[PDB]
């Protein structure tokens, strides 16, 4: 009758309340059939774990050797598709060894038997199925209850307990397979033996279940306590000694201590697994009362809580005002309180931040933040869609529980539980028409009135969490979910970038910087890292001190009583406990509060609710508690777990500082409503966890034991089938490997469970043939087959990729390597094309083809859900099928002259049509659990399940082919993908071809490579030999209105490249008209994947593709993050295989055809649209110089904040477009910002201090744009400036160039006339628009050779200078003369030479440079970073230099060797021979090569010391004028700058005629400068190591500097 | 006559910026007692007036 | 100069309108403080 | 200055009407906030 | 038209008087609301 045994995997809580109902006082027939099958010796529902330990199976009961050989074949094809023969053996030998070890094979054949029984009882309407033999037990299933008996002892359980047994065998299949693979893929030995001993120990504990599972829960905190108690050099902690593991189980204590003595990291990985053993029920009778109590505990008096919360308001106002001054660069309005400090009012009027405000937060209790922005009522569309189910109202709570349990507990039938009572999905009820008007939805929340149907939260225990009393997650109503999304988006968009604590937690660059501050301060050991884990962080927030920071948040966003709703709303919502077959009693349709099954109103909201508020609140109490004790500190706040860097002060020792800090934290956090024990909240200097990743001394433990053994709900929103079981396994491996799991272990486990899932749901005729299993594995979802964990490269890379060449490469490797004919592949695939193009599936998914596979679940999809919601503004959305307008618009887009599906999808997403299709797609894929499409219409889709099983049987067994895929699979794969796209769509597709990067780049090693053979390559190089410790410890090298705005962005993108199409502009105007805007024109606008990034801190890389693709102005279809990630994963795979990365390697191109230039062609639409607008789907001067002028002032305001501590994120721009921009205007705009700023005495000191040294992220960016400098020569200030001042280094040159308005008024008056008022009015938000005009209209920079001294034969002496300011000039002089003497076309230089010396060898014309890098781009990056003319980028042969390890010619850099250039003399060109250059370990006279007349010179020659004296006299005026200002600069110690000015003074004193003293007494005071003392206040400065027209027009200070003493 | 009166309007504006700040201080003391006393036995709270965004 | 201070007195009126709307949002919570206490 | 002075007087008069209404609001809110120690 | 300028200048003086008597009552309801928050 009723359909039974719904779930195929566990997604429900585990209580034997149904078992207690069957065992006590029942009369229903299913309890009668369950009581009749149990034996006399019956284990209870708590003791199901004792049954399955004793279960031995008759060995090799399933002949799964076909699956073993298939796993070896599949994994061989996968890891040969990446062309990796070393890591293949460590996978298939490990997979074989798991399938050979008797305990692991016993668990896996147990799992095959379990899931075969599940697949034979899933959706069985028959009440009792026959007894089936599993191992040695006999299984019998009645209703939702399972009876298992081994020999004489039976165990009655629910079907969720049987699924917990099945998923426990599945979990141990995960854990043992991943343990054998990890022991194969990690340098320490295989811990499979320790897992077997741990399983035997955990199964051998004969204790009562609650204390037993307390041991199982506390296996991880006690292990962390052991690691702490062994490795706390700075502190002493009582964290380990509380847990009773030595007293309850001596064997497990011995095992844990043994694991401690082997490796703490491996102990943490073994501790990290959650429910790989038997699922520890949910323990409602004690554990739920614990949780419902932890929620509502009261720990502190309300007066102290409110006083401390107002102190939190003081610090939050101080931090947000600091953020607003730092970001908006102007002050927010400041109150004038009688009793306010006058310093705050003076800081308001001056417009600058006071350093004394940091340690004095209390005065900010008088000063608030005025309204700065408006609240966005409509939410972001992407974050509402997934990862959380809802309840529709308060009437939909009865669906989760069983009516029979309510009948046996209270005698009632739970008010019709099969009543649906509205659509239970999130987004189906969201745009149902009730709640589609989101501003009117949150208008009650804007009023603060909450609907009675909203206030209900369902608390659900989750499978696979190591806690045993049951951690619950929050499941609220739709309106509260929309409220949470809007509030968290409003905090993330605006509040977090201002706050200095949480701009770290949002911005990835600041997160990297703060994690680096974590890493350096934990490796030095000076600053301690406390990990303050709160047991009830989600439950410790109170109504009295939630200290919600919401008050102020409400005033800044121009709303009233919106954010203040979200602190009382923890107490508004009624919390109920979802228990399977254990319902809370219904009073009047609502559950009644008992303290066990339901708690009507708790003082907190749950987990994941009000997260963004509560993180800032916790950070506020940590800032107060640590600034009352005067320490320096940084906070990372994950939420429930907190990590604080605290720096050691000189006043207190480290242990005393930490004990005082913990006393202060306990005192203030007790006033924060979080009463903390020593065992609950603990100090550390080694262990800290942020972002759900545990670090011990900066070593992250691999999560491969935890997230691989992590099951989701699965089979959601469809009929149960093989296709989405394999696709859901693929998504589980994806979500594991994005969140720090090794992709090789995840891929191998996915292959093994893929083959097990094939074994469960296929007849034995298929399963006896190895070739058919391999070919069924390697088809993929894109071309007409089953989804596989093999077929996504997104497991190894970012989210966006083109799967199609990778699918073709997997098939090609299947046909070529494994002995399978192509006709067999066509038999498996059966390629059937659609007769007509379904263009909507192209514009929604660019990579999707026109073909229709039968393995995909064929629900009606487009209209079935629409007919369901029509039967049950919903009319305006769904009276017209939007696929009609979508197909008409996309047919019009198909009449493009070049066809680009990315551009078609972009112009689709501009329309309201794609908004309607996204409404439809969320009605298709709601991502809720079971309750919207899995539950609805279940009778007619069980027949579809059997039909799809028979269909895959018929398709696999029938050898009749579909379309012959041999023409596609022959030849190259990118053309094959494009031709398949043309053949299924009827028209060729351009712009969507992203080739497989391993097909594109196939790695080798530099010692295995030949330089002239090998191609253009994007490679790495390590700094040390790497091992297991090097994978873990970090290294040196670093790591709607919006629719209207995007419509304007694409319209101005059309306008900026100067293309006008009447059809395209007409269609874009139609888009503006349907959005409600009448006017046609409106004037308005190295992180990698994180898993493998730690290895990349030891590695170095750059974009070395410039010899094939970057030299053209056209862009290409190369994604460089994917190339870098592939190189990191190859290094990671070689390390984990057992070898080491000592020799640097290479990623060289193998498929030269596969690189596709994207066409520089605009698209013209041939056909006018027939859309005519909708208006129902929505309810309510040349640009190059302006972009240059915005770029200059943007660099100026970026440099402005660096002296206070890029700023405007300038690093997210391509270097090529910046090189296209004219940089004459940028330098004038950079100069004028400091004139317009007029900074005070203190900031001008920092401008001198930090920029003469090579420091600054903005400074490094402006070096990066000037890395090749044709921008420097074409700039009109700089050819004038180069005679004037003495540029010392490039770091000196750029710093002098930016600070010229501050240091010299003379240069300002030359360029003061080039000011324009309308260029001030051009905003920065147009600049990233206008840089597109640089891309197409803007010509490339000339890359001109600013020729230095070419040194051929003889010539007249012009000075012959090369780094004469600091370095030994003769060292580079003799190198230029040696390479001209040898007449080398090709020159070799080792990285031991100073990079500025090997810089000057690249300015010689007709000299190809092949540096002996051996793999290292760092040396070439340094000597590219030293140039000022850009000629180094043209004469260094990067593919020959970058991949060559050994010496192949004349090498500069070895100290002694064959074929090695190594480092009186009456020579006119050089006055002396400082360095003797030896060739072939032999001395050769250098003097024959002399100078020549030259062109305009690069910055190696230093134009001021050349023949011109008037510019050097101007320089002698300028440096004394600099020093007179800098003495007057307050807080600036002029020791190095006085030394620079004194070097200029000695260079002047050679010309002034007075004798030069070697040591000058040089009395310095205020400013006057002379050797003789003018007055007593002058200070002696010790400098060692040291016509008449210049006297005309000489200042009096230089007259003092003229005469000695 | 116009300029001295314009200075008086500047005094009006300088006091008005202070008046904008006084109320914005003075919400945040009863804001936290509305936050505080939310003990939530049955949790009904009825706000006074509707508000436009 | 008359029109400049004419707009300047109008923005002074707009600020008073916004303060009145915000201070009536202040009213809705002491009313529920009389019920929650 | 036939048109500017009259509308200037009206634009000052509308603020004169507005600030007395907010003064009445301030008196009403003073009446509300004197009940705070009547509850606590 | 300088006579109406003097009339609206007197109105500016009335606006100044109203702003001062709003500062007074805001100070009183500053004091009362601030002495609320210590007791709860
Ligand atoms: Zn190719
Ligand atoms: Zn250069």
């Amino acid at each position: 009758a009723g359909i039974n045994r719904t779930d195929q995997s566990l997604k429900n809580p585990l209580l034997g309340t149904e078992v207690s109902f069957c065992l006590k006082s029942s009369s229903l027939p299913h309890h009668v059939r369950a009581l009749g099958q149990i034996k006399a010796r019956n284990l209870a529902s708590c003791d199901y774990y004792l049954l399955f330990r004793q279960v031995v199976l008759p060995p090799e009961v399933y002949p799964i050797g076909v699956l073993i050989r298939a796993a070896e074949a599949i994994l061989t094809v996968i890891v040969s598709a990446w062309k990796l023969e070393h890591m293949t053996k460590t996978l298939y030998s490990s997979v074989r060894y798991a399938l050979t070890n008797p305990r692991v094979r016993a668990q896996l054949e147990l799992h095959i038997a379990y899931q075969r029984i599940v697949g034979q009882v899933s959706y069985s309407r028959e009440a009792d199925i026959g007894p089936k033999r599993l191992g040695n037990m006999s299984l019998q299933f009645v209703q939702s209850l399972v009876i298992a008996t081994i020999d004489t002892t039976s165990c009655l359980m629910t079907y969720n307990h049987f699924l917990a047994a099945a998923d426990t065998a599945k979990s141990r299949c995960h854990l043992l397979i991943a343990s054998v693979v990890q022991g194969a893929l990690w340098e320490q030995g295989s811990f499979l033996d320790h897992i077997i001993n741990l399983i035997d120990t955990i199964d051998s504990i004969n204790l009562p279940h609650d204390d037993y599972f307390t041991i199982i829960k506390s296996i991880s905190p006690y292990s962390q306590g052991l690691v702490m108690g062994r490795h706390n050099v700075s502190v002493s902690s009582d964290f380990a000694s509380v847990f009773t593991i030595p007293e309850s189980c001596p064997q497990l204590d011995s095992l844990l201590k043994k694991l401690l003595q082997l490796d703490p990291v491996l102990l943490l990985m073994v501790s990290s697994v959650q429910k790989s053993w038997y699922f520890p029920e949910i323990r409602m009778v004690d554990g739920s009362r614990e949780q419902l109590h932890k929620m509502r505990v009261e720990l502190e008096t309300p007066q102290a809580l409110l006083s401390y919360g107002h102190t939190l308001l003081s610090i939050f106002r101080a931090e947000f005002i600091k953020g607003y001054v730092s970001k908006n660069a102007k002050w927010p309005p400041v109150h004038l309180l009688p009793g306010c400090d006058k310093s705050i009012k003076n800081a308001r009027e001056l417009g600058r931040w006071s350093p004394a405000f940091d340690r004095r937060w209390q005065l900010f209790a008088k000063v608030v933040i005025l309204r700065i922005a408006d609240l966005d009522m409509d939410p972001d569309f992407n974050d509402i869609v997934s990862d959380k189910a809802i309840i529709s109202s308060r009437r939909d709570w009865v669906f989760e529980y069983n009516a029979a349990a309510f009948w046996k507990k209270y005698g009632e039938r739970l008010e019709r539980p099969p009543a649906r009572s509205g659509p239970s999905r999130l987004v189906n009820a969201l745009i149902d028409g009730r709640l589609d008007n989101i501003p009117a939805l949150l208008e009650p929340f804007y009023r603060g009135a909450v609907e009675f149907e909203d206030r209900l939260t369902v608390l659900v225990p989750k499978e696979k969490e190591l806690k045993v009393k049951g951690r619950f997650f929050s499941k609220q109503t739709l309106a509260i979910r929309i409220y949470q999304v809007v509030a968290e988006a409003a905090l993330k968009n605006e509040v977090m970038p201002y706050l200095k604590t949480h701009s770290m937690t949002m911005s990835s660059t600041a997160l990297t910087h703060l994690l680096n501050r974590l890493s350096h301060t934990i490796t030095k050991g000076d600053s301690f890292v406390i990990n303050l884990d709160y047991s009830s962080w989600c439950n410790g927030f109170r109504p009295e001190l939630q200290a919600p920071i919401c008050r102020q948040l409400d005033q800044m966003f121009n709303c009233g009583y919106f954010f203040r709703t979200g602190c009382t709303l923890p107490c508004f919502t009624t919390f109920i406990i979802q228990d399977r077959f254990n319902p809370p009693y219904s009073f009047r349709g609502e559950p009644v509060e008992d303290g066990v099954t339901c708690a009507v109103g708790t003082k907190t909201m749950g987990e994941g609710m009000r997260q963004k508020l509560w993180t800032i609140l916790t950070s506020c109490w940590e800032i107060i508690a640590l600034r009352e004790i005067n320490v320096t500190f940084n906070i990372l706040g994950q939420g429930d777990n907190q990590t604080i860097i605290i720096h050691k002060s000189a006043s207190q020792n480290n242990q005393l500082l930490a004990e005082r800090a913990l006393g202060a934290l306990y005192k203030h956090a007790r006033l924060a409503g979080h009463n903390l024990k020593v065992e609950e909240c603990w100090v550390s200097d080694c262990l800290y966890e942020y972002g759900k990743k545990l670090f011990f001394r900066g070593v992250p433990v691999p999560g491969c034991l935890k997230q691989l053994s992590r099951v989701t709900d699965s089979t959601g929103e469809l009929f149960p089938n093989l296709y989405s079981k394999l696709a859901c396994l693929t998504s589980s491996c994806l979500s594991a490997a994005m969140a720090d799991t090794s992709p090789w272990v995840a891929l191998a486990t996915g292959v093994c469970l893929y083959l097990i899932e094939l074994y469960v749901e296929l007849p034995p005729a298929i399963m006896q043939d190895e070739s058919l299993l391999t070919t069924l594995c390697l088809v993929g979802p894109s071309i007409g087959g089953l989804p596989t964990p093999a077929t996504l490269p997104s497991v190894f890379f970012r989210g966006m990729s083109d799967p199609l060449p990778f699918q073709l490469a997997l098939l090609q490797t299947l046909i070529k390597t494994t002995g399978v004919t192509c006709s067999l592949v066509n038999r498996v695939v059966k390629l059937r094309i659609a007769p007509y193009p379904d263009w909507l599936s192209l514009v929604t998914d660019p990579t999707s083809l026109n073909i229709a596979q039968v393995y995909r679940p064929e629900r009606q999809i487009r209209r079935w859900i629409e007919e369901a919601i029509a039967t049950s503004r919903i009319a305006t959305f769904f009276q017209q099928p939007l696929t009609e307008m979508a197909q008409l618009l996309a047919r019009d887009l198909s009449t493009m002259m070049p066809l680009r599906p990315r551009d078609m999808s972009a112009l689709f997403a501009l329309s309201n049509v794609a908004y309607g299709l996204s409404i439809i797609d969320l009605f298709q894929k709601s991502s809720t659990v079971v309750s919207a499409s899995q539950a609805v219409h279940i009778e007619d889709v069980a027949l579809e399940s059997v039909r799809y099983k028979e269909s895959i049987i018929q398709g696999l067994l029938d050898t009749t082919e579909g379309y012959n895929m041999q023409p596609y699979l022959e030849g190259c794969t990118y053309l094959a993908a494009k031709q398949l796209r043309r053949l299924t769509w009827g028209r060729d597709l351009v712009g969507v071809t992203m080739p497989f990067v391993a097909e594109q780049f196939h790695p080798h090693s530099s010692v295995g490579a030949k330089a002239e053979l090998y191609l253009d390559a994007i490679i790495y190089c390590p700094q040390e030999t790497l091992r297991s410790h090097h994978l873990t410890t970090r290294g040196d090298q670093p790591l709607a209105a919006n629719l209207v705005k995007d419509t304007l962005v694409l319209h101005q993108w059309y306008k900026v490249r100067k293309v006008t199409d009447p059809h395209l502009n007409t269609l874009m105007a139609r888009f503006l008209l349907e959005k409600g805007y009448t006017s046609d024109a409106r004037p308005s606008i190295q992180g990698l994947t994180g898993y493998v990034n730690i290895l990349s801190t030891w590695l170095r890389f750059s974009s070395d593709y410039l010899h094939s693709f970057s030299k053209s102005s056209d862009d290409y279809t190369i994604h460089f993050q994917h190339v870098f990630t592939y190189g990191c994963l190859y290094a990671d795979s070689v390390i984990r295989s057992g070898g080491v990365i000592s020799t640097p390697y290479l990623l060289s191109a193998s498929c030269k055809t596969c690189f596709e230039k994207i066409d520089s062609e605009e698209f013209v639409l041939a056909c006018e649209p027939q859309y005519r607008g909708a208006e129902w789907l929505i309810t309510k001067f040349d640009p190059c110089v302006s972009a240059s002028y915005c770029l200059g002032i943007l660099i100026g305001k970026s440099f402005l904040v660096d002296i206070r501590a890029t700023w405007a994120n300038l690093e997210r721009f391509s270097i090529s477009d910046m090189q296209k921009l004219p940089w004459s205007i940028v330098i004038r705009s950079l100069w004028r910002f400091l004139i317009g700023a007029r900074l005070l005495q203190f900031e001008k000191a920092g401008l001198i201090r930090m920029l003469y040294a090579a420091t600054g992220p903005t400074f490094s960016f402006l070096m990066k744009v000037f890395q090749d400098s044709a921008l420097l020569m074409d700039c009109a200030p700089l050819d004038r400036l180069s005679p004037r001042i003495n540029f010392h280094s490039r770091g000196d040159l750029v710093a002098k160039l930016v600070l010229l308005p501050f240091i010299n008024p003379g240069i300002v008056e030359i360029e003061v006339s080039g000011i324009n008022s309308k260029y001030h009015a051009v905003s920065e938000a147009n600049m990233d628009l206008y840089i597109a005009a640089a891309k197409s209209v803007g010509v490339k920079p000339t890359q001109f050779v600013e020729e230095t001294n070419d040194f051929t034969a003889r010539g007249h002496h012009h000075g012959c200078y090369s780094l004469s300011w600091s370095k030994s000039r003769n060292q580079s002089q003799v190198l230029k003369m040696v390479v001209r003497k040898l007449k080398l076309c090709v020159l070799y230089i080792y990285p031991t030479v100073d990079p500025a010396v090997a810089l000057d060898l690249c300015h010689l014309p007709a000299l190809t440079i092949i540096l002996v890098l051996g793999g290292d781009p760092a040396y070439y990056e340094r000597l590219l970073e030293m140039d000022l003319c850009g000629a180094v980028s043209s004469r260094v042969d990067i593919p020959h230099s970058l991949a060559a390890r050994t010496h192949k010619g004349f090498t500069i850099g070895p100290d002694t060797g064959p074929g090695v250039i190594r480092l009186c003399y009456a020579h006119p060109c050089l006055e002396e021979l400082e360095f003797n250059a030896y060739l072939d370990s032999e001395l050769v006279d250098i003097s024959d090569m002399c100078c020549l007349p030259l062109a305009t010179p690069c910055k190696a020659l230093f134009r001021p010391i050349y023949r011109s004296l008037q510019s050097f006299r101007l320089a002698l005026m300028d440096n004394y004028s600099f020093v007179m200002d800098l003495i007057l600069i307050r807080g600036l110690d002029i020791r190095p700058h006085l030394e620079e000015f004194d070097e200029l003074l000695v260079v002047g004193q050679h010309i002034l005629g007075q004798p030069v003293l070697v040591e000058v007494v040089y009395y310095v005071g205020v400013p006057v400068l002379a050797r003789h003392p003018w007055s007593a206040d002058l200070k002696r400065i010790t400098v060692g190591g040291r016509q008449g027209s210049l006297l005309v027009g000489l200042p009096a200070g230089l007259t003092q500097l003229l005469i000695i003493d | 006559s116009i300029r001295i009166l314009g200075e008086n309007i500047k005094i009006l504006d300088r006091s008005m910026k202070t008046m904008m700040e006084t109320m914005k201080l003075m919400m945040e003391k009863v804001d936290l007692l509305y936050a505080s006393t939310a003990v939530g036995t049955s949790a009904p709270m009825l706000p006074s007036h509707p508000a436009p965004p």
Side-chain angles (χ1 to χ4, degrees), chain A residues 1403 1427-1430 1498:
Chain A
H1403 293 88
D1427 215 17
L1428 280 299
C1429 67
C1498 198

PDB file of all heavy atoms in Angstrom, chain A residues 1403 1427-1430 1498, ligand 2:
ATOM      1  N   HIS A1403      71.073  45.393 -22.362  1.00  0.00           N
ATOM      2  CA  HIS A1403      70.926  46.617 -23.143  1.00  0.00           C
ATOM      3  C   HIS A1403      71.828  46.655 -24.366  1.00  0.00           C
ATOM      4  O   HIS A1403      71.758  47.619 -25.133  1.00  0.00           O
ATOM      5  CB  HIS A1403      71.206  47.858 -22.288  1.00  0.00           C
ATOM      6  CG  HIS A1403      70.191  48.099 -21.214  1.00  0.00           C
ATOM      7  ND1 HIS A1403      70.288  47.539 -19.960  1.00  0.00           N
ATOM      8  CD2 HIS A1403      69.061  48.844 -21.209  1.00  0.00           C
ATOM      9  CE1 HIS A1403      69.259  47.927 -19.227  1.00  0.00           C
ATOM     10  NE2 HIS A1403      68.497  48.716 -19.962  1.00  0.00           N
ATOM     11  N   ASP A1427      65.171  46.983 -14.881  1.00  0.00           N
ATOM     12  CA  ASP A1427      65.376  47.833 -16.047  1.00  0.00           C
ATOM     13  C   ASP A1427      64.495  49.070 -16.030  1.00  0.00           C
ATOM     14  O   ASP A1427      63.497  49.153 -15.314  1.00  0.00           O
ATOM     15  CB  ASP A1427      65.121  47.118 -17.370  1.00  0.00           C
ATOM     16  CG  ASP A1427      66.065  47.613 -18.444  1.00  0.00           C
ATOM     17  OD1 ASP A1427      67.079  48.230 -18.055  1.00  0.00           O
ATOM     18  OD2 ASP A1427      65.783  47.492 -19.651  1.00  0.00           O
ATOM     19  N   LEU A1428      64.878  50.031 -16.874  1.00  0.00           N
ATOM     20  CA  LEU A1428      64.117  51.257 -17.050  1.00  0.00           C
ATOM     21  C   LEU A1428      63.820  51.529 -18.520  1.00  0.00           C
ATOM     22  O   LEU A1428      63.281  52.592 -18.844  1.00  0.00           O
ATOM     23  CB  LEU A1428      64.853  52.463 -16.446  1.00  0.00           C
ATOM     24  CG  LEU A1428      64.810  52.752 -14.933  1.00  0.00           C
ATOM     25  CD1 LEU A1428      63.389  53.008 -14.422  1.00  0.00           C
ATOM     26  CD2 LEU A1428      65.567  51.744 -14.062  1.00  0.00           C
ATOM     27  N   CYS A1429      64.158  50.609 -19.424  1.00  0.00           N
ATOM     28  CA  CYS A1429      63.921  50.819 -20.847  1.00  0.00           C
ATOM     29  C   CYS A1429      63.098  49.732 -21.514  1.00  0.00           C
ATOM     30  O   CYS A1429      62.639  49.946 -22.641  1.00  0.00           O
ATOM     31  CB  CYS A1429      65.248  50.958 -21.605  1.00  0.00           C
ATOM     32  SG  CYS A1429      66.257  49.477 -21.674  1.00  0.00           S
ATOM     33  N   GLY A1430      62.906  48.580 -20.880  1.00  0.00           N
ATOM     34  CA  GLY A1430      62.084  47.535 -21.445  1.00  0.00           C
ATOM     35  C   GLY A1430      62.761  46.666 -22.479  1.00  0.00           C
ATOM     36  O   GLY A1430      62.110  45.765 -23.024  1.00  0.00           O
ATOM     37  N   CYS A1498      69.786  54.296 -21.519  1.00  0.00           N
ATOM     38  CA  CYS A1498      68.994  53.777 -20.415  1.00  0.00           C
ATOM     39  C   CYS A1498      69.544  54.302 -19.088  1.00  0.00           C
ATOM     40  O   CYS A1498      70.543  55.025 -19.026  1.00  0.00           O
ATOM     41  CB  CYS A1498      68.984  52.246 -20.444  1.00  0.00           C
ATOM     42  SG  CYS A1498      67.678  51.400 -19.478  1.00  0.00           S
TER      43      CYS A1498
HETATM   44 ZN1  LIG F   2      66.389  49.468 -19.386  1.00  0.00          ZN
END
